[PDB]
Design an enzyme around this catalytic site. Structure first.
Site, short mmCIF file in Angstrom:
data_model
loop_
_atom_site.label_atom_id
_atom_site.label_comp_id
_atom_site.label_asym_id
_atom_site.label_seq_id
_atom_site.Cartn_x
_atom_site.Cartn_y
_atom_site.Cartn_z
CG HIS A 40 -2.87 -2.57 -6.85
ND1 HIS A 40 -1.52 -2.52 -6.84
CD2 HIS A 40 -3.38 -1.89 -6.77
CE1 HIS A 40 -0.98 -0.83 -7.64
NE2 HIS A 40 -2.30 -0.48 -7.68
CD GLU A 71 2.00 -6.04 -6.95
OE1 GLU A 71 2.51 -6.93 -6.24
OE2 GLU A 71 1.28 -5.88 -6.30
CB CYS A 143 -1.04 4.69 -8.00
SG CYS A 143 0.19 5.38 -9.70
#
EC number: 3.4.22.28
Length: 176
Positions: A40, A71, A143
């Site tokens: 992300h 991811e 994060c």
């Protein structure tokens, strides 16, 4: 306590705060100028690393071989100084432990460490309406944080919700 001591040391030596157009994240340098970011973070052609601009020569959105999402985004950086090699801290397969710490190094969570306890291989997970494997699980209320235990870097935090937190396992073969 040993996991905390190991984490503080590991973060001082190999981690940095990264700013992309999508936010501020924790980045962990692995070897050479090869680093890892949670997917992300969506790094662009350049990122800011400890408040100073740096170019990205390559980015690899890791996938398993049924094409599934892992991811994680491996990124090769354009800088002189090289990362203390930590590939020996990376397991060959998903690690389960009874005491883990999640470490974050940005500005909303500066030099912060969270005890998350036992970590268990969670496996498949539909993260963002996206099929994802190699997920590690721990209880995490509220994060790119780095999940570690004594002598082991287990994964990178990519998600969760109220009581469970998820990390992409950081495996040795992603790096050769």
């Amino acid at each position: 306590g040993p996991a905390f001591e190991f984490a503080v040391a590991m973060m001082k030596r190999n981690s940095s705060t990264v700013k992309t157009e999508y936010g501020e994240f924790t980045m962990l340098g692995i070897y050479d100028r090869w680093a890892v970011l949670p997917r992300h973070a969506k790094p662009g052609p350049t990122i800011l690393m400890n408040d100073q601009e740096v170019g990205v020569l390559d980015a690899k959105e890791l996938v398993d071989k049924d094409g599934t999402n892992l991811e994680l985004t491996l990124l090769k950086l354009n800088r002189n100084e090289k990362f203390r090699d930590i590939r020996g801290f990376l397991a060959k397969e998903e690690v389960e432990v009874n005491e883990a710490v999640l470490a974050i190094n940005t500005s909303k969570f500066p030099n912060m460490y969270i005890p998350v306890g036992q970590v268990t291989e969670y496996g498949f997970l539909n993260l963002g309406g996206t099929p994802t494997k190699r997920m590690l699980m721990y209880n995490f209320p509220t994060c790119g944080g780095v999940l570690m235990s004594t002598g082991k870097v287990l994964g990178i935090h990519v998600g969760g919700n109220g009581h469970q937190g998820f990390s992409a396992a950081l495996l040795k073969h992603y790096f050769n």
